[PDB]
Structures are given as C-alpha cells and as structure tokens.
Design goal:
Layout (H helix, E strand, L loop, with lengths): L2 E6 L1 E7 L2 E6 L5 E4 L6 H13 L3 E5 L6 E6 L2 H10 L14 E2 L2 H12 L22 H14 L5 E12 L4 E15 L5 E6 L11 H7 L9 E9 L2 E4 L5 E3 L4 H10 L19
Parallel strand pairs: 7-9
Antiparallel strand pairs: 1-5, 2-3, 3-4, 5-6, 8-9, 8-11, 9-10, 12-13
Length: 280
C-alpha cells in the first residue's frame, strides 16, 4: 500500500507542531513523519542518517508527503551515495569569464534566461520551469548557468537553507532549501558586485542576494526562517548541509527534470511528480 520513493540521503530533521519534518538531498520538498511509538525506530534511522549523511530507503503513504516506512541501505547503496554526494571537488575544464563586464550585459543575460521560461513563445526545449516553484530549483539553476556559459561566462550558485516559504503572488510553497545563480559583474565604476538571477521569484531582473533570501522567508505563507546559506562554484548542482557536492556535468539530470516538469505550473502538484527515472 505504501509508495516506494527509493533510496535517498536525508539532510535535515526538524520538529514542528507535533510532527517531524524531514528534508532530503536534491529535492526541496519537506516530508513528514508522526512521532508515534510505532514510528520511533524509523525516526531514529532518519536521525542517524541525517547525522552521518547516509542513505535510507523511503516509503510514503500514497498521495502524500508522509513517510510510512524507512528501511536500511545496503553496503552497495552506501558505496554509491559516497560516489555521487562527494567531498571530492572538481572544477570546470574550460576557462570562461567569471565576471560580467557591465550591467548592460548582466541585463542581456537576464533577458536571455527569462526568454527560456516555460510558457513563453521565445523558449526552446527543454524550457526552464520557473512557473512551477514546487521543486526543481537545482535544475532551473543549472540551466540558467548553461545560458551564461553559452555566452562565455560562468557564475556561482547560492544555496539557502531553512524553514523556507515563498509566494508566487497567488499561492505559497514550502522548501527545505533553494538555489539560484549568483552572478558577478562590474558596476559603472568598475567595481565588482553580485546579483541573483531567479525568475521563479523575481520576474523583473537581477536582485540582491539579501532581497532574494528574504523572498524565501515569506511569512505571509506561514512560519519561515533562514538557517544558513552557502555560495559555491557554478558547477555544483546540489550542496548538502554537510558541504558535500553533487554534480550534473552534462545536464543529463537537469534536462530530464525540466522535461518532466515542463507542463506544470503553480503550487500544485505537491509533492512534485517522481524524477527518480532521471539519471546522471
């Protein structure tokens, strides 16, 4: 009767209103488990796995974000997850420009990125699923970076973590983390500044990282707060709270996730459809 969610690494466990909120690598979604006697071992398994950044096998109650069962990972699972969620740091091959020359160019890049939004006639496949903020921030950010790279630039990622909530203006989503591209550019006087580009939250243009993180703690949606943020090299697809990195060097996962979410919009479905079939 339970839905097989597959293997994953839990990265956070946080008590709220008599329920345990669990976060997992890569996905922005929170899962929940009730602190009942019958769940006490599943909860311990999750706590230890969070502590040690180790994988578990998750089963969900159907049509929900509620965990119904947790099973241990095999030695093979442990070995595999160590290979993909890694402390090994690998940089880009070619040397693109890390600093955009002026605001006009920054703005051009913004427009190119927004022109790739799903739901706009200018976009090519796979389009960037900005209109679907439920999940997939990681894929949207990696695709934004690819656009910069197509123009000869690289950038950073900024990952923000916490009890996050954001509004589209019509509905709210809850996230354990969010990511967008953090672009360096020279201002009018030649001094380097940084801005976030994230059309899923700011449709008008680049914004400060302070403003961007503030949009991730929108208290009109409910309780919200930031616990941490970290800037990384652009090539990092996902960064865990333990500072491990996951990569998607050829955008195999990115394009697969964007394709899966292409027709989705708004704050539903939630949780998002399964993207486990997407590999690297």
């Amino acid at each position: 009767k339970l839905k097989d969610f597959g293997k994953t690494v839990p990265v956070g466990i946080d008590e709220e209103n008599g329920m345990i909120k669990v976060s997992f690598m890569l996905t922005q979604q929170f899962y929940e488990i009730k602190p009942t006697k019958e769940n006490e071992q599943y909860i311990g398994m999750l706590r230890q796995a969070v502590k040690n950044e180790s994988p578990v096998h998750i089963f969900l109650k159907p049509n929900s974000n509620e965990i119904g069962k947790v099973e241990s990972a095999s030695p093979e699972d442990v070995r595999y997850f160590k290979t993909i969620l890694t402390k090994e740091v690998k940089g880009q091959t070619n040397k693109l420009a890390s600093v955009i020359p002026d605001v006009a160019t920054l703005n051009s890049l913004f427009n190119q990125i927004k022109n790739q939004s799903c739901g706009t006639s200018t976009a090519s496949s796979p389009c960037i699923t900005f209109r679907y903020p439920v999940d997939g921030c990681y894929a949207r950010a990696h695709k934004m970076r690819q656009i910069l790279m197509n123009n000869g630039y690289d950038c950073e990622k900024q990952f923000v973590y916490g009890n996050l909530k954001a509004s589209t203006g019509t509905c709210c989503v809850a996230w354990s983390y969010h990511v967008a591209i953090l672009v360096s550019y020279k201002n009018a006087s030649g001094v380097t500044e940084k801005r976030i580009i994230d059309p899923s939250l700011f449709s008008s243009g680049p914004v400060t990282d302070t403003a961007w993180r503030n949009a991730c703690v929108n208290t009109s949606c409910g309780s919200a707060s930031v616990s941490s943020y970290a800037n990384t090299a652009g090539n990092v697809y996902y960064r865990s709270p333990s500072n491990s990195y996951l990569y998607d060097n050829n955008l195999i996962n990115t394009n697969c996730v964007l394709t899966k979410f292409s027709l989705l919009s708004g704050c539903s479905p939630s949780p998002a459809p399964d993207v486990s079939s997407c590999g690297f």
